[PDB]
């Protein structure tokens, strides 16, 4: 019965004294300068130019001497500015989105003054008007002129619209009657549809020691079916002199350290990955005594990796509980997993980095005493899924208390000499027994394999672990004869022979697990293909799909370049195109292996040589792309998701999801999994919300962040039952205009590899259309006849730049992201260009749906004029498309029906039909 | 061009609003502001107030607050003028002025209307 | 807020005669006043702005002194074309102000 004022009432009396308070701060102060000390002889003078900040810089100072300490009167320094303009540009704009950009003018003059604001057109966006008159000598983009009172703030907006990718600069200049200041601004404009990252990578042995010899490999230049009209395909290139080369070169190449994958910062996992190249960089330099490499200083080089590692170590301090437990994100529930892995890391980090031991024991003592069962396995604390296993719900939950009991081995044998003890050793003993005797029954290649590595931690000499070594070693798949490649997938009912030749997150842990496996019983005919094969299942970043297998793939390859001693690297290498011109050749040495990563520039075959020599060279190629369709991918999700209205009042988005397992899989629902949203250009989310969601014990989701215009949530499990949805408000922060349709995507966390994606959009109705609203796209002629003679159809048919003019007939109308895709089947060929159109076959036309000017009607005849004849290659085949532009021309055509009008406009299409079959021009 | 178009002279009571409206034509109307001014008969003339076409943007003198009216048309370039509760000594001569905002600092009053001759009905 | 007043009423101008008619404002405008004239029953054109430049169309017979609170006209000989009103205008400040006006006697 309460009106909206005690609504809010209630509200802010509970949010008092229910909590006591929360740390946070909501001003920001960036990094101080003027940090540097000097020696002064009495005299001295350090010039330099302030930041651009409107701020009081109190700068004080302090010396000392033999005499003593002496503290300088703090000087007032105070940077201002009394007309100043600010200016806000979003992230990212679509092409083809009619955007006004807003931005605000302050004014902190005693009395009121006026002003003018004029836009600068760059080449690339149309202004809806192109003020720029070139008329006169001195050219400007006039102005609106607006006024401001005294010590006033007033707004200033201007609507634009891009048209090339990514154009970069436009400028802004404030007039006033005392002159004028200028303000260089950025415009970011990105492509349509999704990115989407191909990787093809290769191994160089020219000697062949690890069985095979490669001098050369062929990447082909392959346009995706579904690629972006207007967009170019992106590909990078990186050449390393090692098997961890790239990873180094992720270290030392970049400053900062880079997250090896696109995957979210919130659970205290990825926290913790973030010190993993640093380490294993850090185990090869010091293991091999490799640290020649620097020509600089190489313990300097040592001291500041060393602090890196420390820093990266205290990096997830925060997710520690009372007890020292590690939960899974911060103050909720602690997991038994997430601790033993962090016990992982820290037990590894320690050799180099001497760790808190009494820390470190009580974990091992929280974790072990905590949750175990009588029969040595282990129970898992929260609701947390780390993986979803297959087989029914009896053959699920004992594959997964297996699957935790290896894992937990793993980490307290990795962490063990820091805290030797009677108990923990105990609890090893029934897990390891556990582990031995209810492992043999094998269900999936993955449980196995893991169980093998944490057995392989252990005691070597048990005949019941050399029988799983031998059963798993019976699951092995292998490519070529005698063995070139080698690795596992998850073998149950899949033991026939299937290999899709895709990277599987799982597949690269499983394959990751037996590897470590054979690296620890030092088996090493058996190696040579797996490593053979995970140098070329990596990426650019030297991060592979998913974290899990990332970590102990990266583990094993650095164990293996330890164990294995590395050969002497010299190599002539050389990058070129088959049909082109030569690109950049690498001569790679010991010295400069970490060369730059260089981006492949033009569209063509490329193929990589190189001459004799020693040594094992990664080289690998990321593609990245866009495309308009998620027809063709594997969606493991039910998605839905809308936007309603409501009764101030605002708009509302609903997202909602449901897991599809597979047959082997069962009812019980996802693992980890994340929820990706791509927010529409120029319009934010409630953060209130969200934080909503997350902050209480009733929460829908265990973390949320804003990255980006991304609005990405993680759950424990997605239930496979019913649908669950995500709810918030949105805010528009300008208007926008034919906006672009965003992505919406949900994946596991653990396995990316299912994943489902889908296009959504505020909603869409038609805008008035008048000013360079249509840029380019179409025109069509009116129905029937007019003053249209065919002798000017004759002009505008044989005009050089129309390629091809027929007629055709409707087929398909398929709308796809904003653009149009007409099927048609020819009817009557007059003149073709470069491209050959066959009688009655199913060609393809491309439209920009903006346009309201020319639209097509279903299955009637047209008569079209192209002016472009289009060609793409699935190197297979070449397929042809056909542009539409608004200098191709396209006319009605009736069917044979006598209307008043009707003969003489067949007399006059007819008369200019067989003119031109006359090759007449 | 540069044209504009001053309305008719208009005769009303002491009290009754009276209207008199000003048209643009040549140039873009919702691009400059236009400048409303009054002269009495024989002596010094006053500034009235101006308006941002497209913007509707308005300001007035103080004196003559809340006894004047500015509307804008887009339709046929025009803008519209009302003086409620004016009196006999108000009835005087109207212009409209455009108002020039250089790149530099020179500011105009550039075209200018051909006035409005308004009378009080007595 | 800002304001000027115009000076003089009138002054005695023959056709060769050298005049001057002067105007000052409430507060500085540096460089920010116009001049012009009105033909009786007629629109005023302008004539000088920026307290300096002169307009195109504008005859070079007319001069004009800019800087300050206090602004100065100078016409070394009058014309048939020089008699009628004359007023000063300030352009800077939000409200934009006036003149009282000048008278032009034309015969000695």
């Known amino acids: 019965n309460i009106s909206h004022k005690d609504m809010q009432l209630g509200r802010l009396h509970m949010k008092t004294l229910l909590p006591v308070s929360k740390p946070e701060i909501r001003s920001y102060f960036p990094e101080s300068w003027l940090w540097e000390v000097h020696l002064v002889p009495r005299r001295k003078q350090l010039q330099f130019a302030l930041p651009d900040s409107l701020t009081t810089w109190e700068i004080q100072g302090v010396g000392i001497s033999n005499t003593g300490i002496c503290v300088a009167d703090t000087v007032k320094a105070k940077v201002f500015k009394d007309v100043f303009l600010e200016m806000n540009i979003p992230y990212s704009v679509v092409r083809g989105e009619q955007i006004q950009l807003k931005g605000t003018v302050y004014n902190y003059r005693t009395s009121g003054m006026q002003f003018c604001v004029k836009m600068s057109a760059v080449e690339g966006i149309c202004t809806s008007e192109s003020p720029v008159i070139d008329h006169q000598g001195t050219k400007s983009s006039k102005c609106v002129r607006q006024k401001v009172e005294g010590s006033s703030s007033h707004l200033v907006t201007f609507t634009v619209l891009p048209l090339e990718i990514g154009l970069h600069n436009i400028n802004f200049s404030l007039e006033t009657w005392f002159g004028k200041e200028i303000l260089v601004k950025t415009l970011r404009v990105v492509p349509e549809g999704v990115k989407r990252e191909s990787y093809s990578g290769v191994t160089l042995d020219p000697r062949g020691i690890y069985g095979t010899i490669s001098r050369r490999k062929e990447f082909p230049y392959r346009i995706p079916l579904d690629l972006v009209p207007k967009t170019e395909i992106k590909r990078i290139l990186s050449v390393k002199g090692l098997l961890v080369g790239e990873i180094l070169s992720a270290v030392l190449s970049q400053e900062g350290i880079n997250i090896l994958t696109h995957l979210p910062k919130g659970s205290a996992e990825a926290e913790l990955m973030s010190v993993v190249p640093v380490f294993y960089v850090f185990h090869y330099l010091e293991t091999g005594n490799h640290w020649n490499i620097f020509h600089s200083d190489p313990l300097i080089e040592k001291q500041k990796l060393k602090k890196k590692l420390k820093e990266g170590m205290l990096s997830i301090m925060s997710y520690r509980n009372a007890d020292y437990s590690y939960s899974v994100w911060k103050g909720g529930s602690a997991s038994t997993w997430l601790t033993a892995f962090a016990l992982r890391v820290l037990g590894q980090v320690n050799k180099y980095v001497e760790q808190n031991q009494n820390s470190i024991c009580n974990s091992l003592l929280w974790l072990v005493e905590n949750y175990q069962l009588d029969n040595g396995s282990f129970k898992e604390n929260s609701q947390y899924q780390p993986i979803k296993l297959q087989g029914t719900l009896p053959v699920e939950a004992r594959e997964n208390s297996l699957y935790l009991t290896a894992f937990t081995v793993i980490g307290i044998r990795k962490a063990f000499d820091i805290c030797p003890l009677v108990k923990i050793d105990t609890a090893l003993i029934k897990a390891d027994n556990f582990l031995l005797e209810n492992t043999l029954p094998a269900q999936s290649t993955f449980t196995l394999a893991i169980s093998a590595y944490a057995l392989s931690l252990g005691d070597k000499t048990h005949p019941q672990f050399r029988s799983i070594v031998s059963a798993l070693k019976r699951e092995a798949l292998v490519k070529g004869n005698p063995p070139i490649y080698r690795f596992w997938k998850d073998n149950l009912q899949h033991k026939d022979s299937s290999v899709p030749n895709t990277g599987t997150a799982r597949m690269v842990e499983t394959t990751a697990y037996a590897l470590l496996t054979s690296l620890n019983l030092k088996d090493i005919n058996y190696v040579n293909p797996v490593i053979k094969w995970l140098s070329e299942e990596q990426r650019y970043g030297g991060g592979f799909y998913s974290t899990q297998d990332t970590i102990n793939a990266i583990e094993g390859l650095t164990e293996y370049s330890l164990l294995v001693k590395q050969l002497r690297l010299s190599m002539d290498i050389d990058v070129s195109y088959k049909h082109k011109g030569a690109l950049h050749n690498y001569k790679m040495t010991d010295k400069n292996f970490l060369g730059r990563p260089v981006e492949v520039l033009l569209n063509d075959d490329l193929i990589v040589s190189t001459g004799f020599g020693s040594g094992l060279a990664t080289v690998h190629v990321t593609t990245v792309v866009h495309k308009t369709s998620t027809s063709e991918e594997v969606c493991s999700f039910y998605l839905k998701i809308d936007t309603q209205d409501i009764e101030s009042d605002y708009k509302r988005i609903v997202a909602c999801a449901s897991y599809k397992p597979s047959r082997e899989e069962s009812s019980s629902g996802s693992s980890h999994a994340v929820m990706d949203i791509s927010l529409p250009t120029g319009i934010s989310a409630n953060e209130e919300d969200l934080k909503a969601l997350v902050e209480g014990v009733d929460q829908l989701f265990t973390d949320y962040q804003i990255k980006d215009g991304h609005v990405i949530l993680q759950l424990n499990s997605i239930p496979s039952s019913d649908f669950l949805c995500v709810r918030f408000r949105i805010f528009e922060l300008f208007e926008v205009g034919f906006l672009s349709p965003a992505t919406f995507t949900v994946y596991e966390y653990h396995r990316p590899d299912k994943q489902c994606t889908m296009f959504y959009s505020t909603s869409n109705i038609k805008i008035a259309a008048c000013k360079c609203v249509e840029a380019d796209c179409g025109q069509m002629q009116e129905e029937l006849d007019l003053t249209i003679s065919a002798e000017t159809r004759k002009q505008t048919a044989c005009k050089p730049e129309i390629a091809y003019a027929y007629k055709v007939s409707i087929t398909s109308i398929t709308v796809e992201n904003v653009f149009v895709k007409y099927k048609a089947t020819l009817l009557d060929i007059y003149k073709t260009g470069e491209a050959v159109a066959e009688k009655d076959s199913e060609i393809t036309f491309i439209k920009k749906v903006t346009c309201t000017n020319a639209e097509l009607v279903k299955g009637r005849q047209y008569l079209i004029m192209g002016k472009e004849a289009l060609q793409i290659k699935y190197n297979f085949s070449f397929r042809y498309i056909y542009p539409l532009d608004s200098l191709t021309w396209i006319e009605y055509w009736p069917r044979d029906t006598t209307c008043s009008s009707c003969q003489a406009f067949l007399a006059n299409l007819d008369e200019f039909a067989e003119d031109i079959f006359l090759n007449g021009c | 061009q540069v044209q504009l178009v001053q309305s008719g002279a208009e005769v009303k009571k002491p009290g009754a609003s009276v209207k008199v409206s000003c048209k643009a034509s040549?140039?873009?109307?919702?691009?400059?502001?236009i400048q409303w001014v009054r002269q009495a008969p024989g002596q010094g003339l006053e500034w009235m107030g101006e308006?941002?076409?497209?913007?509707?943007?308005?300001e007035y003198t103080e004196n003559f607050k809340d006894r004047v009216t500015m509307t804008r048309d887009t339709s046929t370039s025009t803008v519209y003028m009302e003086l409620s509760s004016l009196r006999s000594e108000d009835t005087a001569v109207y212009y409209c002025?455009?108002?020039?905002?250089?790149?530099?600092?020179?500011?105009?009053?550039?075209?200018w209307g051909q006035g409005t001759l308004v009378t009080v009905s007595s | 807020d800002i304001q000027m007043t115009q000076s003089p009423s009138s002054l005695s101008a023959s056709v060769g005669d050298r005049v001057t008619i002067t105007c000052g404002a409430s507060?500085?405008?540096?460089?920010?006043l116009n001049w012009y004239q009105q033909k009786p029953g007629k629109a005023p054109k302008l004539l000088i702005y920026?307290?300096?430049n002169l307009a195109d169309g504008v005859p070079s017979r007319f001069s004009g002194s800019g800087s300050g609170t206090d602004f100065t006209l100078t016409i070394s000989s009058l014309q048939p074309e020089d008699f009628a009103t004359y007023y000063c205008?300030?352009?800077?400040?939000?409200?934009?102000?006036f003149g009282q006006g000048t008278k032009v006697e034309i015969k000695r």
């Open positions: 002025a455009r108002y020039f905002f250089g790149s530099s600092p020179n500011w105009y009053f550039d075209v």
């Open positions: 920026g307290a300096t």
């Open positions: 205008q300030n352009v800077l400040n939000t409200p934009l102000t």
């Open positions: 040549g140039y873009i109307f919702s691009n400059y502001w």
């Open positions: 308006i941002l076409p497209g913007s509707g943007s308005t």
């Open positions: 507060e500085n405008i540096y460089g920010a």
